[PDB]
């Protein structure tokens, strides 16, 4: 069985999320029809928190992330100049090799055209922003961006720029405080438990953060995190991370070994299909 975006992958969880998405359709249709997002920022934040329709993610993400504004502030041939320039990126080979073990099973991303597209975007970005260059985390991010953006490489390039340059803090990709605090405040049983087994949350959440959940969660669940990330900013990362720990807390407390807990939570995270409950839990304000 595959998900919406074609990744092979509870069935009730996904049906519930699809039916709830269907409820929002007439509201979103009104806006794309008028070719304008809601003026009311409170209303817009609420809508985005409930999930952008997949078919509108290019429309909404590219605007709320600021990628449209960045694109428009460069010449129209800019991406193509960067693609050509990236042909001699210092990172070309690393980018290529990092693709021999990412997306093994996606039918298009594992195709020659999909590999080439992903490489073009990353090599382009690596010369555009030489200070950042390329890091492995960006491979699966751009891969999911390509799939969510209907294989639009230039869109993916400008969304990646918005993310790295404007949304994430500077230095994110150069050579957790919040989450550990939140665990101690909101999940005191879990904190005692992590201390007792000497579990370092950064072993789990490092990839969560650097890869923006893209190697951790089912793709449709990831995109809901991205919906709010591209509108509200990077606090979404620790809010969703805490929500994951809240949701699987009962599960973790019965595991008496740090390595075991890591494997079990990675398995749990990989089948987190209830994207509605994940986001609603991330924003619930329980404990405030």
Domain residue ranges in the chain: 1-65+176-288, 66-175
Sign of torsion, CA 87 92 97 102? negative
Collapsing DSSP to helix, strand or coil, 6 comes out as: coil
Are the C-beta atoms of residues 165 and 157 closer than 8 Å to each other? no
Q: Residue 225: exposed, middle, or buried by beta-carbon count in 10 A (0-12, 13-18, 19+)? A: buried
Are the C-beta atoms of residues 158 and 71 closer than 8 Å to each other? yes
Distances (CA, A) of 109 to 17, 19, 238: 25, 28, 28
Q: Residue 165: exposed, middle, or buried by beta-carbon count in 10 A (0-12, 13-18, 19+)? A: middle
d(CA 160, CA 217): 19
Contact residues for 252 (Cβ-Cβ < 8 A; gap 6+):
190, 193, 245, 261, 264, 265
Are the C-beta atoms of residues 156 and 145 closer than 8 Å to each other? yes
Collapsing DSSP to helix, strand or coil, 8 comes out as: strand
d(CA 58, CA 142): 14
The DSSP secondary structure of 46-57, one letter per residue, reads HHHHT---GGGH
Tokens of 197: 């087994």
| Torsion (CA) 97, 103, 109, 113 in degrees, nearest 10 | 30
Q: Residue 34: exposed, middle, or buried by beta-carbon count in 10 A (0-12, 13-18, 19+)? A: exposed
Distance of CA 159 to the CA centre of its chain: 12
Residue entry with tokens 């990126």: 89
Which residues is 8 bridged to in the sheet?
2
Tokens of 60: 């909404």
The domain over range 66-175 is classified in CATH as 3.30.70.1350: no
């Amino acid at each position: 069985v595959h998900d919406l975006y074609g990744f092979p992958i509870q069935e009730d969880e996904r049906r519930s999320c699809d039916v709830n998405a269907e409820r929002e359709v007439p509201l979103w249709q009104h806006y794309i029809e008028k070719d304008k997002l809601p003026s009311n920022e409170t209303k817009l934040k609420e809508m985005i928190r409930k999930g952008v329709p997949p078919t509108l993610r290019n429309w909404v993400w590219m605007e709320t992330s600021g990628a449209n504004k960045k694109k428009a502030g460069h010449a129209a041939n800019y991406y193509s100049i960067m693609v050509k320039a990236g042909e001699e990126s210092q990172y070309k080979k690393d980018i290529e090799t990092d693709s021999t073990h990412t997306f093994p099973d996606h039918p298009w991303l594992s195709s020659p055209d999909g590999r080439a597209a992903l490489c073009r975007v990353l090599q382009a970005y690596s010369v555009h922003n030489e200070r950042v260059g390329y890091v492995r985390a960006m491979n699966t991010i751009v891969g999911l961006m390509l799939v969510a953006l209907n294989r639009n490489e230039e869109a993916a390039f400008w969304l990646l720029a918005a993310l790295v340059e404007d949304i994430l803090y500077p230095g994110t990709y150069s050579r957790m405080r919040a989450l550990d605090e939140l665990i101690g405040t909101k999940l005191p049983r879990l904190q005692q438990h992590f201390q007792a087994i000497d579990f370092d949350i950064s072993m789990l959440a490092t990839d969560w953060y650097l890869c923006l959940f893209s190697v951790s969660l089912p793709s449709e669940t990831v995109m809901r995190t991205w919906d709010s990330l591209f509108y509200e900013g990077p606090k979404i990362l620790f809010r969703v991370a805490l929500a994951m720990l809240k949701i699987y807390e009962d599960n973790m407390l019965r595991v008496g070994d740090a390595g075991e807990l890591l494997m079990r939570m990675r398995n749990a995270a990989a089948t987190m299909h209830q994207r509605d409950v994940l986001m609603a839990t991330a924003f619930d304000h329980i404990g405030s």
